[PDB]
Design an enzyme around this catalytic site. Structure first.
Site, mmCIF file in Angstrom:
data_model
loop_
_atom_site.group_PDB
_atom_site.id
_atom_site.type_symbol
_atom_site.label_atom_id
_atom_site.label_comp_id
_atom_site.label_asym_id
_atom_site.label_seq_id
_atom_site.Cartn_x
_atom_site.Cartn_y
_atom_site.Cartn_z
ATOM 1 C CG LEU D 15 -1.904 -1.041 1.422
ATOM 2 C CD1 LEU D 15 -2.482 -0.977 2.818
ATOM 3 C CD2 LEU D 15 -2.997 -0.892 0.379
ATOM 4 N N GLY D 16 0.352 2.331 -0.540
ATOM 5 C CA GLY D 16 0.844 3.660 -0.221
ATOM 6 C C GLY D 16 2.320 3.854 -0.503
ATOM 7 C CG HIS D 38 -5.095 -7.990 4.961
ATOM 8 N ND1 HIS D 38 -5.329 -8.685 6.028
ATOM 9 C CD2 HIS D 38 -5.246 -6.665 5.197
ATOM 10 C CE1 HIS D 38 -5.686 -7.777 6.980
ATOM 11 N NE2 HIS D 38 -5.629 -6.562 6.459
ATOM 12 C CE1 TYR D 154 2.400 6.746 12.666
ATOM 13 C CE2 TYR D 154 3.144 9.023 12.698
ATOM 14 C CZ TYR D 154 2.951 7.835 12.010
ATOM 15 O OH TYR D 154 3.213 7.792 10.661
ATOM 16 C CB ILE D 189 2.216 10.732 1.616
ATOM 17 C CG1 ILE D 189 3.636 11.194 1.972
ATOM 18 C CG2 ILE D 189 2.189 10.006 0.275
ATOM 19 C CD1 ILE D 189 4.283 12.156 1.006
ATOM 20 N N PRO D 192 -5.044 6.222 -0.632
ATOM 21 C CG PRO D 192 -5.463 4.453 -2.096
ATOM 22 C CD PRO D 192 -4.340 5.307 -1.542
ATOM 23 C CG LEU D 193 -5.263 3.680 4.324
ATOM 24 C CD1 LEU D 193 -4.097 3.253 5.209
ATOM 25 C CD2 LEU D 193 -6.559 3.000 4.746
HETATM 26 CL CL LIG Z 1 -3.345 3.265 1.130
#
Ligand SMILES: [Cl-]
Ligand SMILES: [Cl-]
Ligand SMILES: [Cl-]
Ligand SMILES: [Cl-]
Ligand SMILES: [Mg+2]
Ligand SMILES: [Mg+2]
Ligand SMILES: [Mg+2]
Ligand SMILES: [Mg+2]
Ligand SMILES: [Mg+2]
Ligand SMILES: [Mg+2]
Lengths: 250, 250, 250, 250
Positions: D15-16, D38, D154, D189, D192-193
């Site tokens: 991802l990403g 996944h 974080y 950045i 999609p998230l």
């Molecule tokens: Cl993402």
């Protein structure tokens, strides 16, 4: 008295942060010479703090190299050997790098950078190897850490002060001079000059500027300077001390 | 070609780090004007990299404000609008703050600080709002982060470059100028000037200085500059890029 | 008395830096609970400073989350609402990252990172919105700024403390909680544990480690903590305070 | 091909940012194993970049210590000795320090801190002394430099990664392991998230957050990682590389 026996020069000591530094230095037992450009302001400032056995004003522009020599001599004649130099005199220009004229550039650097160099260089020479617990406190600011698009020359000066001070600290430490050099980095501090600019304090107090949602006061800078001038800080050298309401933490 | 269409000015581009930057810029498709003080050195340097359709030498001292104007005009006449400015020209003085003469102080700052200011200011003015993907790369050093007791004025200059560059980066970003400004911070780099000083490389290669146990080479700085000049780094502005063999990590 | 009315928890307050912090806090008018692992050491430590109207020992491991709850209750029952938390408890492991076992990793982080988190989180909850002039002082170190090849897990912990503290400082400032959060970063400090390791002080005192050519003493850290606990530092939050003999300046 | 012969593990590579790193690594001639939680996502991700002669997916949680061992073995069986480790897997929790549950704290640190430790430790062990030009790229963020009141755990994790990486860099340099360790620090950045969280991009694009007035894209992080994985950066170790639209410059 936390500054027993200390003898300090505070440049730009007639207004604002410098005035508060001088005030608390005298409160803690130091003898102080404050400098500034204007006699009316300077004589009122000195007498607001104390009599001439503890504080005196000398008219001096920190950019004036020859005057530095004389300033140390005047101070030592009054109070004995100088132990503490607070390079606080400074000016500001509200210009981006793009918009800064060369005249503005040179004028700001003559006070904010040359003045700190002159006071640091001469302070080392005149205080080294005397067992004084000597301390040079160079006034940088938050603009020594982060940019401000409207303060290009000021940023240059404050970054220069920040790193030059580390060089001096190291040389003094390695040579056992008994001289420490540190930088103080105020965030926004309420003064008459801020009060004179409509809207400035509110701008500076926005959470995206100062997370505490208000600006500081001159004594906020005075108290960190007392620590740095005192023998309490005898193991602190080459370091930056930030008092900024959280400005640089975000 | 990673710098397709770029047109770069590399100050102090006839020797050392600047020469390697120019070399790799040409390799990656940029057109380059290199500056330096001396014609013999500069003409040899340019022709060692390429012909005049890709690289030219202009004699220029970065402290010379009027010459900056002309340098942009010469470069644009040769190659079209400038897109990339590498403020690399610099000098050094081996003096503690204590021992620095005012002449030394002013001379070093005239190149290392004024030259970077002049190139940054003019680069913003002449490159903004043209869709060029413009990039100003200001050469600081490890001495923009940490003190060296023997490099007082140099430290001042490199700290000033570090923070001034953030101001410029911010102004350009906030105004959508399509100009980025970043600093590069070399550690020790092997050059003929280092080779000329007996013992220098061995001093610089001690583990207490450079943890890798050797010093770098000019192409080490060239490659980070290619990244910063290229559109690959279009989201990088106001940042410091350190290539130092670990010097500042300890 | 610079800490009039303050009520402090000093974790790891029975030895070294923590003991000196407790000592000077009591000297400046604070009431103090010191924690440590061992009753013999802790009861001797408390009584060396004062009677139970000003200082008490509580046996507590900073990694013990449930014990934190109880520690605040014990302290408030003794002295009234806690105003000041010094997260000083810590352990060390002398291993490179490469050589660190996962057991070592987790054990060190349970004290040095979880303990600071637990004390910071609970300090905010129990001190916010009470007009106490509350201050959380998180003990990072020079290893929160620079690597040491022999202290991998310790470096992780001290870097985490450094930046986590800024998050907490900001949240407290933005919400007007009347809680400040800052980090203190000692360099090398002479203690019985250093004295127990043959050669350690000499290693730490080399100029390539500590430019002053000697190491500090526990009161060097106590005095910066007095400043940070006191209302003198009411505009300081989210900042790092380095007392290191110049270690990080080079 | 700028990564000729390199063999990379990219954690969270499905991802990403991680996906883009993998994509550009393959483009530049590296062989890559991407990990993720996944299978559906991971198999699609790998085949979107290339065939199994250049890229493969392995299901792995970076917090799973035993799986790390196996991941190196799988990668070496596919492509030969690993040269490059990108510790990119991470999770986030939107809680202040005050509001962080201990479960949240431990879960976030298990991925963001333990996973980076596991990959760094094992990368050193399995890549040292092989003449590979090995490079460990640890993904910190702007939250490794500055606090965010809503990202307490974080922040702890990213500060830990920042400083732990310097320890590893130094040890590898001092021992001539032919392994470099650096941190990359993205600002915001677009992924999609981010797109899934209504209002997030606009919040992140305010000038008081990102001075460029927009957020970045995954390839912005890919290109700095190509530089760091490549032999172009053979003198860069222990350093932080910030690609943030100016976030940290103000
Ligand atoms: Cl993402
Ligand atoms: Cl004023
Ligand atoms: Cl040369
Ligand atoms: Cl001890
Ligand atoms: Mg009006
Ligand atoms: Mg000879
Ligand atoms: Mg023995
Ligand atoms: Mg260092
Ligand atoms: Mg809705
Ligand atoms: Mg900021």
């Amino acid at each position: 008295d936390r500054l027993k026996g200390k003898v300090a020069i505070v440049t730009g000591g007639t207004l604002g942060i410098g005035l508060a530094i001088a005030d608390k230095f005298v409160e803690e037992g130091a003898k102080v010479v404050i400098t500034g450009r204007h006699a009316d302001v300077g004589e009122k400032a000195a007498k607001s703090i104390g009599g001439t056995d503890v504080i005196r004003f000398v008219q001096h522009d920190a950019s004036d190299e020859a005057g530095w020599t004389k300033l140390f001599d005047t101070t030592e004649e009054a109070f004995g050997p100088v132990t503490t130099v607070v390079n606080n005199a400074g000016i500001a220009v509200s210009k981006s790098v793009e918009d800064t004229t060369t005249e503005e550039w040179r004028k700001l650097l003559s006070v904010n950078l040359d003045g700190v160099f002159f006071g640091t260089r001469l302070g080392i020479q005149r205080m080294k190897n005397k067992g004084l617990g000597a301390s040079i406190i160079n006034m940088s600011s938050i603009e020594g850490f982060v940019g401000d698009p409207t303060l290009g020359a000021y940023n240059a000066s404050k970054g220069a002060v920040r790193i030059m001070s580390k060089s001096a600290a190291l040389d003094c430490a390695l040579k056992d001079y008994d001289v420490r050099v540190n930088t103080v980095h105020p965030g926004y501090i309420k003064t008459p000059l801020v009060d004179d600019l409509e809207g400035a304090e509110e701008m500076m107090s926005q959470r995206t500027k100062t997370p505490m949602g208000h600006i500081g006061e001159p004594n906020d800078i005075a108290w960190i300077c007392v620590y740095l001038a005192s023998d309490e800080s005898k193991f602190a050298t080459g370091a930056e001390f930030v008092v900024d309401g959280g400005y640089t933490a975000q």
